[PDB]
Amino acid sequence: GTVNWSVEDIVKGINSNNLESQLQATQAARKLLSREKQPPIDNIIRAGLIPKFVSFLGKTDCSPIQFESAWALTNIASGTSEQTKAVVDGGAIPAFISLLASPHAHISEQAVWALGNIAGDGSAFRDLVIKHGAIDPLLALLAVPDLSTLACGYLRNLTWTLSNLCRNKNPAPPLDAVEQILPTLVRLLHHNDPEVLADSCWAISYLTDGPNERIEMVVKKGVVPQLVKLLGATELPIVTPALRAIGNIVTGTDEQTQKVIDAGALAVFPSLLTNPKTNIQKEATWTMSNITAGRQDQIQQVVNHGLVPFLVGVLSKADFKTQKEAAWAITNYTSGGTVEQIVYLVHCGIIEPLMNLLSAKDTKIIQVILDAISNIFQAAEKLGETEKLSIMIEECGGLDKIEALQRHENESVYKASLNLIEKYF
């Protein structure tokens, strides 16, 4: 009946002014937009249908047309920025926010979904959804004693939409909206559904991707322990956002970094730094770099947890981008560590893999590695062991490469190269 209609037929029905004919045509439109085979979004837009669908959202008397119009508008808003803009320009936002109060749960959910697509377009639409007052009605739908009594699909859609209201920078969401949402997010981060957890962690990852003040809002709510627990999960869709959030947090102050350490995070990194997913290894090594950039007592906790051999490991063999983060982690460690800590690092075998990476075709990593050699030499100078280190570097193929680098395009390279040679070789 409502399968495989032309746009011309949908228009004729929608312009009928028979509410039932309009309902059938709206359903036909929804079925068009629901096909995965290149749905005719732009034809629907050009036919002038969006305003019609929008006004159908307000027909309380006819709940099916409300739902069918909601779903159609959801799928248009799922497209390009320009397609999302057509929906917004049609007045959909306040109309979807009204539908959040629908007594029919399927209609409520569809409105949640639509607003999620709208907010997910970018900061401007996110903030427009917020200005139209979406947050209160959204949070009201989660105001139950136990999240478990709500339908699974519904809770997941709400969580996802909330995560899109936390998403995007330039600018980041309004501080007062973030404060309003955070308590609910903390509750969702303790729910037992893998998908609710993943999206909750993504939200937290977004909120922590900013200056120390943004991080502090999150860290102050006491979520770091739960993030660390989630970091230990089996499901990669949970670990990925949890790790991103933990990594963001350690870009903050040393006191913010300490919360992560105090919550037990470092005990998961043996797995993370050997994880079979490239991205987890990269992001875990990146996280380590910002912990090695901390205080000496923090560096010492890295040492105590047994993670220096893991850094040696990643430096020795990983995707290049991971090895680059490992180089940073080492340079940070050597920059901030005590003499004893730098000695330990050399005893764990850092010299050969550092030297192997000077063959890299990446000017940045060379500068990072050269910095690290310098800092290590500085620690040797304080021990009168510049000779032993010189020999080690010579014996694993290092001197050759540092020499060659005295004749390198980049200035810092050739400079730091010649300084090392002349002082130590």
């Binding site: 350690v250 990146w286 770099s289 910002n290 950039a293 901390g294 940070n332 920059s335």
Partner: peptide, 6 residues
């Protein structure tokens, strides 16, 4: 000991 974001 310079922290760097992403």
């Amino acid at each position: 000991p310079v922290k760097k974001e992403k």
